[PDB]
Amino acid sequence: LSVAIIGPGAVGTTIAYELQQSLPHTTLIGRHAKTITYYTVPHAPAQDIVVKGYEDVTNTFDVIIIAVKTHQLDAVIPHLTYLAHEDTLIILAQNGYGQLEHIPFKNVCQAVVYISGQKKGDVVTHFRDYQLRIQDNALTRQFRDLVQDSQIDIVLEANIQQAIWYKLLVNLGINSITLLGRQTVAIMHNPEIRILCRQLLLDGCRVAQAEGLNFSEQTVDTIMTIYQGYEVEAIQGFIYRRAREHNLDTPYLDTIYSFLRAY
């Protein structure tokens, strides 16, 4: 079984490297043929990862992992014509709820990525975690069985909706405040901010209820507790659009999204 990983980024390289250690035919595809300096962890022996451009690949793949930014997806899709066949499993290694409908293939699955890493130039440094949460089906089980030996942790989900939406809420809270406030997590020291955070979470959590998921105020409590231990259109934009889809009243979400739209 052949595997391709579109997107030579922090997530893409980390996945591509770990799969090449199990199934070496795993191909990392980018826009240009380049070489990426990769660290499995900080202070690890530097490794060169082969990145082959679209023009270099001549074969179709059974499993394609798209790990580009959510606003970069539309640029990747046209290349799926020659990169994929009819029954190719397409996995979106992206944040938020990706544009699943934009991809004209039968087997398209949204993945919840929990892989922390950064890219500076062509030097990718991985920090921790190798987890990918995907919807449980026959092909995602086959892909799970294939990456048995790799430390890539594939978590098959009965309903990936709950996994997707939970991370949506997590990013909704702390990342919106840190971005708009232009500070670290220490901005949560302000009592007014913490109130906003819960209200912001409750807004998104209210949208999650409308989508049919079992998220209550206790979900907010657990997420707020997580914050004590430390792509807008696809994240906040998605929660916002579904808030209008159900004609909901989410003022805190509306305000955050209004400023994030203004960059």
Ligand X SMILES: NC(=O)c1ccc[n+]([C@@H]2O[C@H](COP(=O)([O-])OP(=O)(O)OC[C@H]3O[C@@H](n4cnc5c(N)ncnc54)[C@H](OP(=O)(O)O)[C@@H]3O)[C@@H](O)[C@H]2O)c1
Identified binder of ligand X from the candidate list 8, 20, 109, 177, rule CB under 6 A: 8
247 binds, among ligand X, its own copies, none (CB under 5 to 8 A by kind): none
Other CB atoms within a 10 A radius of the CB of residue 153 amount to 15
Identified binder of its own copies from the candidate list 63, 65, 133, 240, rule CB under 8 A: 133
Report the residue closest to ligand X, judged by CB: 9
How far apart, in whole angstroms, are the C-alpha atoms of residue 78 and residue 115?
A: 27
Residue type, 37: T
Other CB atoms within a 10 A radius of the CB of residue 247 amount to 7
| Nearest distance, CB of residue 88 and ligand X, angstroms | 17
Spell out, one character per residue from 38 to 77, where the chain touches its own copies: x when CB under 8 A holds, - when not: --x--x-x-x------------------------------
200-259: contacts with ligand X (CB under 6 A) = 231
11 is a site residue for ligand X (CB under 6 A): yes
Look at strands 108-120 and 123-135 and give their pairing: antiparallel
88 is a site residue for ligand X (CB under 6 A): no
Identified binder of ligand X from the candidate list 49, 99, 117, 252, rule CB under 6 A: 117
Identified binder of its own copies from the candidate list 118, 151, 184, 258, rule CB under 8 A: 151
Count the helix, strand and coil residues of the chain and give each as a percent rounded to the nearest 5: 45, 25, 30
163 binds, among ligand X, its own copies, none (CB under 5 to 8 A by kind): its own copies
163 is a site residue for its own copies (CB under 8 A): yes
| Nearest distance, CB of residue 154 and its own copies, angstroms | 12
Breaks in the chain after (C-N > 2.5 angstroms): 230
157 is a site residue for ligand X (CB under 6 A): no
Nearer to its own copies, 75 or 185 (CB): 185
Nearer to ligand X, 119 or 194 (CB): 119
Look at strands 108-120 and 34-39 and give their pairing: unpaired
Specify the long-range contacts of residues 152-161, CB closer than 8 Å, at least 24 apart. Answer: 152/15, 152/18, 152/19, 153/129, 155/131, 157/112, 157/133, 159/135, 160/109, 160/110, 160/112, 160/133, 160/134, 160/135, 160/136, 161/211, 161/212, 161/213
**Residue 239 and residue 231 in contact, taking contact as beta carbons nearer than 8 Å:** no
Residues at the interface with its own copies (CB under 8 A) = 21, 40, 43, 45, 47, 133, 151, 155, 157, 163, 166, 218, 221-222, 225-226
